[PDB]
């Protein structure tokens, strides 16, 4: 993953990316989802958007990291992809995870 080039963002928070290989953990969780371009800066521990509060709240004690890449070829039509939806209205903020 680290040596790939299609990835647009690869910042890591608790662990440096150069020495990811030599570290053993109990479990690895991969959360996958699609968002828009301007909204990708909100996936970090501590944010105040509509995705960090109503869709994908992250804990402040985060240790993995986030990998985002543009996919305009797969998810696009000359009309629109109305199959991707987001939570716009809620009554309270989501708890982490």
């Amino acid at each position: 993953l680290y040596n790939s080039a299609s990835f647009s963002t690869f910042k890591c928070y608790g662990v440096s990316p150069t020495k990811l290989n030599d570290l053993c953990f109990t479990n690895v969780y991969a959360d996958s989802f699609v968002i828009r371009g301007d909204e990708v800066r909100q996936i970090a521990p501590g944010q105040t958007g509509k995705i960090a509060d109503y869709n994908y709240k992250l804990p402040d004690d985060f240790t993995g990291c986030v990998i985002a890449w543009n996919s305009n070829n797969l998810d696009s039509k000359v009309g629109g992809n109305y199959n991707y939806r987001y939570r716009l209205f809620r009554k309270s903020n989501l708890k982490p995870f």
Partner: antibody, heavy 118, light 105 residues
Framework: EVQLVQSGAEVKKPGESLKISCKGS?????????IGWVRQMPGLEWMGI????????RYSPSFQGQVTISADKSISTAYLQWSSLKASDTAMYYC?????????????WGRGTLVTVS | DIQMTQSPSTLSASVGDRVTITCRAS??????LAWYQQKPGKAPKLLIY???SLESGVPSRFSGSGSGTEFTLTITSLQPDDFATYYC?????????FGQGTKLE
């Protein structure tokens, strides 16, 4: 009238380059779809697809035409880029467009051409 | 890839009769199905998209059903012009594999 049109049939000796061009017409916003070829063996085989705007290609595992298909901006020429072949297999092609964006079924077909080798 | 078995085969029936064909899947796919019409000497023609959804310009006798693995195409009334070949297609994974096909006469 939207249409995918191809040239005439051709036959040539082994070791000679074979190119097939499928032309998209009738609708605007071309090169924003996914264009590709399907092997016509009813006696049903899909090969890779190409996105003209960014020249991105996928390829089936079993079949591989080894084609870097590119389309010019003005003439929208999504011709097969195949400079070599082996006479053992017959690469019978129908050119097909994709709606894209989840609707990955084959919607627009072409009449196609008969390819004879050797 | 996806291995998809078209259990029905060359079938004979009179004009104006119910006909049902099945297209079993190796593993469940969430109604990501396409039915294609084929005639001898003619290019394949798109018939049905998204499992049970009729395309414009197609007679209403054709209908689709099935969720996950039990995908089926049913024609209520057979016609002399309906004697042709049907092709399966799936687009769940990227390796898009067709079906074996069925013959009608």
């Amino acid at each position: 009238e939207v249409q995918l049109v191809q040239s005439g049939a051709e036959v040539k000796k082994p070791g000679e380059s074979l190119k097939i061009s499928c032309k998209g017409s009738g609708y605007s916003f071309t090169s924003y779809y996914w264009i590709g070829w399907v092997r016509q063996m009813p006696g049903l085989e899909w090969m890779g697809i190409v996105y003209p705007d960014d020249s991105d290609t996928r390829y089936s595992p079993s079949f591989q035409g080894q084609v870097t298909i590119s389309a010019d901006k003005s003439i929208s020429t999504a011709y097969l880029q195949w400079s070599s072949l082996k006479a053992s297999d017959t690469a019978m092609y129908y050119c097909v467009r994709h709606p894209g964006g989840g609707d990955w079924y084959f919607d627009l077909w072409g009449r196609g051409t008969l390819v004879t080798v050797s | 890839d996806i291995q998809m078995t078209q259990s029905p085969s060359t079938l004979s029936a009179s004009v104006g009769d119910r006909v049902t064909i099945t297209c079993r899947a190796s593993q469940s796919i969430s109604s990501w199905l396409a039915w294609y019409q084929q005639k001898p000497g003619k290019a394949p023609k798109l018939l049905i998209y998204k499992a049970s959804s009729l395309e414009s310009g197609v007679p209403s006798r054709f209908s689709g059903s099935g969720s996950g693995t039990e995908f089926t195409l049913t024609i209520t009334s057979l016609q002399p012009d309906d004697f042709a070949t049907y092709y399966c297609q799936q687009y769940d994974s990227f390796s898009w594999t067709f079906g074996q096909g069925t013959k009608l006469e």
